[model samples]
Structures are given as C-alpha cells and as structure tokens.
Target chain A: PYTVVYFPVRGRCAALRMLLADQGQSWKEEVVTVETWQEGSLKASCLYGQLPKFQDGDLTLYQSNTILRHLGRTLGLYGKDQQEAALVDMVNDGVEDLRCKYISLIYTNYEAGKDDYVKALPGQLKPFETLLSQNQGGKTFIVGDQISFADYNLLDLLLIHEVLAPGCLDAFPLLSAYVGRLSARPKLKAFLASPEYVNLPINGNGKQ
Target chain B: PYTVVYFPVRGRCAALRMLLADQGQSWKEEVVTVETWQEGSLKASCLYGQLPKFQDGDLTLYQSNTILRHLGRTLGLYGKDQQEAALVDMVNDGVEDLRCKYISLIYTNYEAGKDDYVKALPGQLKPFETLLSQNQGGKTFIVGDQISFADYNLLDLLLIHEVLAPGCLDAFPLLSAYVGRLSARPKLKAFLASPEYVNLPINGNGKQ
Candidate 1:
C-alpha cells in the first residue's frame, strides 16, 4: 500500500505521481490543505517542517527524492547494475541542482529574477542533452536503456520549465524528444492528461 | 582508483573525503585554484560548469551528492537493505536542505543574515536529533546501526555549523553527542586534524 501526503499543489510530488502512474502502481493521496498546514500541529510534527510525506505500509518517509528513490528501489526503476545506478544518481542530482534554482526563481524572486533565469536556461539544459547523446545516441533512457527514477524527475523538471519559459526546450532537440518520448508512455500520457494533473498548479505560489 | 577535482576549499567534498579516509580508501585530489578556474576552459567543459568533479577509474561524475551516493553505493556505505537505503537517502536529503541554507547564508548574505540564521538554528537542528533519538536512542548512527554515507555528510554539516555559530549544537544533546562520537573515529579523527583539512577555509569567500 502506498500513500502520498502533500499540499494540494503538485509542486514536489509531480514526478513521483508520474512515476507511480507510469509504472501502473496504485496509490492514495492525502492532501494537506493550506488551512490544515496553518494549524501548525501537522507542520510541527513533520521531520523537516515540509510536506510530501510518503507512507508505504508502516514505513513513513519524508523528502520527495527519498520517496522517489525508495519507489525506484522497490519498483525496479533504479537501474540494471551499480554503475548504471550511479549514473542515474548523477542525472538526478543535476536535475535537483537546476530544480533548486528554478524554485528560488519561482517563489522568492519571480518578477525580479525571471529574465536572468531564462537567459541562463540554455546552459542549464545543455548538460541533460549531452547526457542523452552519450547514452544510445539520445534515443533511449537518460542513463542505461532502462527507465530510472531520475527520468521521471527530469521529465517533470523539463515540463515545468516549458511552462515557465515557452519554447525553452526548442534549442535542445534531444531533451525535447526525450520529454516527448517519456510523456508518450501509455499510462503516463493518460495521467498527464487527467484532470487531477491538469488542474493543479505547477507550484504552490501560483507561479510556474 | 579515485580522483576528486575541485577548488581547495572543503565546502562540499569534506564528507566524501571523510568517507574515503574512514573507509581506508586512497584517492587523489586535483585542486583547481582560482587562477586556473578563471582560464574558463575547464569550467566550460564541466557538465554543470561546477567544481567537485569526481572520477572513479574512467567514470567521471559531477554534483557533490552524486559523487557521495556513487561512492556510497560502490563502497557499500549506503545501507544494509532496501529499507535502510531509503532511510539513508532521507537523512541525506535533510542534511542537504540545511546545507543549502548554510551555503546561501555563507556566500550570499553572511553579514546580513547571520543573526537570524543563528536564531533559527535550533529548529533546523532538531530533526536530526529527533532522528537519532528514534534509532537506538541516539547511540548508534543516524539511520541504521552501521554508518551510511549520510553520517559523514551530517557530520560535516554539524562541524561547519559549530564554526558558523559557536555552541550551536549545545541545545540538542543527541546531536551534540553524535558529532563528538562520529568525529572520534580513528581515521576520521586523524583526517579532521590534518593540515590538508585544517588549512583550508570552510568556504570559498572566507566566511566560515
């Protein structure tokens, strides 16, 4: 049994939700409304005073990437071997670095920082493109042939970037195609198109 | 064989170095001085245009945590099982979140933000203390009985915080004791007191 508890906004949970949907795994959502969060008890109880608490049976986990990595481990979405797994981590960490920048721009300095952030976007996106090129000529997964948890995380990062800066991925053909390919997976496609995903804002602050 | 390429400062590579020394693994450090970094070629070639590049034999990797996780996975410092591995990740993620805040304060707004940051330090440090209390009543490692990569990272985080805010950990007995216990490991104690670690400033700008 799996349960995801987080704010109503997609925010950090988008990638993991996509992962579960794509893998054909079923899970329940426990939405924490802003009112509930403001009450402080739930916030105080949280390990890091953040949301996106996950429960797999009796094991409760915090941190979004931890949940993804755990699900990746359990669902066999990590990699084929140790080396591949390491590469997968490398990709995920890169994704996280950019994601942190993106988050700062969105929540902390949207109006003041958006222009520079978009200007620096190409260099930030280039590494992922190069990673794809080195792996099966940009045709398959980001690491090895199998889809790792990093793929879903990177896909969500790219998708949200597109929302933030339209045509952002246009210059990077590999990343553009990679996003398309991953989004086209039968279950993932349906999940992305569903009202549950379509209705929630990409971020909690009403910015992309 | 392993090689670490980064600026001389111990900003990020501290934990991994601790892990290497404590685990009895030998590696080479390829330092990139300020003058060399200004040449631009090496910076341009880096996948993320950052330092702390790690090479394991022929496999080169970027991102500090990526290198840490890679070493953890390869050197069997991750955890004993799937569940423990996930917990290890959870602890490391918590460490990273605080580390990011510390970095931002150190690099961007040290003089301006130090007071407020110190005031809020106790709340930020509580989660780790709580985590330790849950596992073996804070006597053992952060997660499971054995030391995972998170231990070294958390150790580095705590050590630097003490430098930033003297007696920061005195509020939390568990964390205070955890830092003391982990620091006393035979090889780690030697490495921490060595000239290589002692000479470098904790951060690049000479803040902490």
Candidate 2:
C-alpha cells in the first residue's frame, strides 16, 4: 500500500509514477489543489514544507528523491549488487543536477534564459551518453542489465527536455534510443498514453 | 584505498572526511589547486565537469552524495534495515536541500542576502529539530539507534550554518545538542580541531 500526496501537476512525481506503472505496482494519489495548498495548513504540516509526500504503510516520507529511493529499495529496482547500486546513485545524482537546472530555467527564467540553457545542453547531457557507451554499447539500462530507478527518472528528464527543446536528444544517439527503448515498455507505454498523464501539465505553472 | 580529488575547500567533502575520520578509515586527498584546475584538462575529464571526484580502487565516482552513499553502503553506515536506510536517505535529502540553499547564498549573495537568510534560518532548520524530537526523544542518532551517513552530512550542514549565523541553532535545542554530541566523537573531534581542517576556508570564496 503506497500513497503519494502532491499537486495535480506532474512536476516531481513523474518518475515515481512511471516506476510504479512499469513495475505493475498500484498506488493511491491524494491530489492537492493550489487553492487547498494556499490554505497553508497542509504546507505547514509537511516535514520540509514541500510536497510529494509518500506513505508506505505507516512510514511517512518527504522529498521526491527520498520517495524514489524508498520505492527503489523496496521494489528491487535499485541494482543487482552494491557496486551497481552505487553506480545507480551516481547516475541519479547526475540526472538530479540537470533536473535542478531545468527547473530553475523553466520556473524562474524561461523567457530570458532559454537560449543559453538550450545551447549549453549538449555538454550537460554528454556524461550520460558516455555512461551508456561504457555500459553495453548503449543497448542496456543506464547502470547494469536490469532497469534501476534511475532509468525512470532519467527517462522523465529526457522526455521533458524533448518537450522543452525539440530534438534536444538528436545529437546524442544513445540517449535518444535509450528514451525510446524505456518508453516502449508495455505498461509504461500505456500509462504514458493514458488520460491521467496526458491531462496534467508537466509543471504547476504550465511552463513545460 | 580511497582518493578524493577536489579544490582545497571543505565545501562538499567535509562530511565524507568527517565520516572517514570518525570511522578511523584512512584515505588520500588529491588536492587540485586553482592553477591546475584553470588548465581545464581535469575539469573537462570529469564525468559531470565538477570536482570532488572520488576513486575507490578501480571505481571512480562523482557527486558528493553518491560518494557518501557508496561509503555508507560499503562501510555499514547506511542503516540496519531497508526501512531505516530509506529514512536515512530522507534525512540526507533534507540536509542536501538546505545545503544547496546555503551554497547559493554563500557564493552569490552573501553580503546582501545574509540578513534575510538568517531570519528565515530557523524555519529551515526546524525540520531536523522536529525529526530529532520524533526519534528517540532527540537523544539517539538521526534515524535509528546507530549513526547513519546522513548524520555526518547533517552535522557538517549544522556546523557551517553556525559559522554563517552565530547561535543559529539556539532556537532548536535538539539540533544544538545533536551538533555538540556528534562533534565530540573522539576521532571526529581530533579531525575537526586539526590544522588540516582548521586552516581551510569553509567555502571556496572565503565566505562561511
């Protein structure tokens, strides 16, 4: 039994939702509307005054990455071994660095900063491409053979970047193919196509 | 057999070094001077084009938290069980969020923004205080009875904040006491008081 409480937008919950869909685990969503959130009680009650609060049984956890890691740990999507798990963390951390930049650009400086951000995007993306090349000829998952939670997070990142700047992944063939391969997972494909996902704005401010 | 490559500041590597010292593990630091880093080769070679590159035998990793988690996983500092491990991550993520804010203020707008930042510091620091109160009446470690890797990171965060805003933790008894307790660990105390740590600036820019 898992419960996720967050805004109606798919800002930070995209990867965790994709992970649950791909893994065939069902969870409940307690959507918080902006009007309700502005009331302040819910925000005040939050551990870090942020959303994407997750409940796994009686254990309540905040932080989007924390939820992902918790699900990754419990659902066996972390890695095959300790080394693989560490590499998984490394990949996820890189993804997070870029994601933070993307969010800042999207929410704070989209009009003025988009060009510079898009121009500098390739260098920011090359590390993942190199990681794929060193792994298994860009064919397998990001870390090891099995799909770790980082894959879903990276997939969501790549997907949104494509939305923000079309053909952003074209220069990086490995990342392009990796997105396609991961998005084609049967259940994940269905979830991606579903109205539940299609209806929500990628961000709360309707930027992306 | 461990090596840390970074600028001479204790900005990010403080927790890892503290962890190593407290755990009585020996490691080498491959310091990168500004002159050498300006040559650009090492920066270009880094996976994410940043410092604090960690090497453990053949496996090289980037990202401070990834290195911390690797050491935590390998050195038995994560937690006793999966649930406890997740809680540890939750704590670390909270610390990381605050640390990022601290870094931004320190590097970008210290003189102008210091007052407002200090005013809001208590609210930002309260979550950890609340977390401690909920766990073992704020007496034991952050998560479980044993000290997890998150403790070291949080400790570093708290220590630097005190430097930034003297008596910042005065409002939170639990956090204040927690800091004093963790800093008093014999090996950690020696390391903190040593010349190597005492001589370096807390940040690269000579801010807190």
Candidate 3:
C-alpha cells in the first residue's frame, strides 16, 4: 500500500521502518544507489532534491517528517485530542532539532567536531529528560500514556546517539529506560536485529 | 487568550504572526530583550534555550513550525482532509529547509556566502514555482483553494528572500504574482504597514 524511495543508508527512514514494523504495516522500498543518483534525473525530479520519497496509493509525498506525520495521521499515532496533538508536535520538533545537529556532525565534520559535540551532549539530552520528568515522573510516554509518532522519532534518536557515543544516556535514567522499552517491542526488536535493518550503514557518507 | 514570547525581532515569528493577522486573531507579545536574555535565567529555563515560545491558555509550546502547525490545527488553517494535510506538511518542510539555509547565511557567514547563495537561489526557488505551476495553474493556493499554513510560511519565505536578493522572483511569474496577491489581503496589508510589525529588525543579529 505504501512505497518509500530512499538511499540504501538507514539515515532518515530507519524510524519510519521501525514504525511500520511495530504497526504491522506492509510497505516496499525503492532503494537509490549513488550511481543511480549520479544519473541526475531522479534527484532533479525530487521536490526538494532530497530522498525518502513516499507514495501512498496515487498521492506522492516528499520530506521524511511529512511521510512520518502522514503515516501517523492515518494510523492513529498522532494523538487523541487537539492538546495532545500539539504536545506530540512539540516532542517531534525537539527530536528533529537534535537530529539535525547529529546529522551535521556526522556528515560535515565528525572527526573535528565529535568531541565538542559529545561534550555538549548532556545539554541536548537534558531537555528530553526534563520533558519526561514533567510528565508523570518519566513513567509515561513522551506526550501521553499511549504511544505517538514522537516516541518513534525519539527512540531512533536515542538509539543512534548511543551508537555515536556509548553511555550517552546513562546519566538520564529516563531516556535509558525509554530506549530499552521501545527497542524491546517484539516486532521492532526482531526487525532491528534482522539483516534487513542491520546490513546498511547508518549514514551514506561512511562516517556514522 | 494567546501570548507569544519572542525576541523583538521578527525572525522566526514573522510567518506565524502574519498568519495570525490574516486570520483576524488578536494576541499579545512578550518581547525578550537582549539584556534580559543575557541575565541567563530565561535561557536556562527555556525548553531548548530558544525563543518564539507560544502560550495558549495553560498550554505552552516551542518550535516555530510546531506553533504554526498548532495554530493551523485549531484555527482551520490546515487542509480540509488527510491527503491535503500531507501536502501541506511537504510544502512547510520545504520552506523550513530553505529558511534554515537563509538564516545561516545571514547570521553565520553572510559576507562570504551571499554571492554563492544568490547564485543557487534559482534552483532553490524553482521547486516552489513548480509546486505553484502544478496546482490550479498557479492561481489558487499552494495546496488548495483554501489558504493553508504553508501558504503563510511560503509567502514570508518569498518576501524575505526578495529582500535578501532583490528581483529574485522575477524569473518566476507565478511566485511574483502570488506575492502581490497575498500581500494585498486587507488585514495582512494593514498589519504589514503598521509599526507593530515593521519596527523590529528582521533578526537578533541585525544583519537583515
């Protein structure tokens, strides 16, 4: 019912893939290689000249966050009410802000910037911990008790950061447990461990 | 009752503020002075150490785009249905991507980057032109006949870029006319002329 076109790397689609797995939705991938991309037409045709294009039936969409939000809307993962939906967007935006920094460090200047970045990691991670702390003492989900799309994004963010800097979440027990709980979801755990998700590098530039 | 807390600059809140004006909604501003920000407590208490925070009743939210999306949801400025919502998000995301680049140029390296950024402007602006070309022969709106939040954001994006690179939209007749059309809306035109909107600098850094 859905098809995602992206690079072989797991860069942006990993969270979407995990969401699909956890939701028991079937989807296909149209993987783009560097050679194919260099051919130039597909890249030119892209709306924003970026990857992870999504098609749901006849309606085509671009932008990774749009794809995630689209799926969330149709699958009832956005939130239950207006206020909850706003809260969900707040959490997702925070995840994206942090993810943008991580991407820049990985692709632009990993070696030169990683140490400084890791040193500032506490400041970055603390907000999310504070968000969780304010909501039922970090016992519930990011926005509410039921899982939302922000949870998936936050989970992927935490997972990748742990790979980027091990023990990064140790100081924030809430995030540590949140990562463990999300990763331990039956279908997600299996999908994460399987070759389908593990075979590709985390980023296209061979850095992360 | 709604209140927006941001720096006196029109930087991040320009589009959303315009949206509020065009919708005939009234809200108060809570401006943060540079000296007040330097006092060091407000930044520490901020969720992500950023401005442009919005308060609606008891709920407070950060992230400019998230605040825009929240306003769109509660105020019927979002799309009419599910598919349209995805398209709206796609347009908004594209705007944000280009806006991020523009912000970096203005604050980070304007003198060094201005020439290159201007040279690449056509490619960056073409996608939105193409988006306009496809929908209703570039006459109605970005997504549908009804104006969505993307239109507000796009209008601001085009407006700011034209200031950055004068006559930038001359090549794209649709965008040029679209700017004229949107800027002429009665409420928005009045607001744009008022000191309330025009008194502040475009950014905190004072480049624009």
Query: What is the C-alpha lDDT profile of model 2 across B105-134, one tens digit per residue?
Result: 998999998989999988998899998999
TM agreement with the true structure for every prediction = 0.99, 0.99, 0.99
Chain B superposition TM-score per model: 0.98, 0.98, 0.98
In candidate 3, how many Å is residue A14 off?
0.8
CAPRI rating of model 1:
high
Error of 1 at B168 (Å): 0.8
Q: Write the per-residue lDDT of candidate 2 for residues A109-187, one digit (tens) a residue.
A: 9999889999999999999999999998989999888999999999999999999899999999999999998899999
**Clashing pairs for predicted structure model 1, backbone only:** none
Candidate 3: residue pairs that collide: none
Looking at model 1 chain B, which ten-residue stretch has the lowest summed lDDT? B199-208
By DockQ, who's the top model here?
Answer: 3
State model 2's lDDT: 0.92
* Ten contiguous residues minimizing lDDT sum, candidate 3 chain B: B199-208
True contacts kept of each: 0.86, 0.80, 0.86
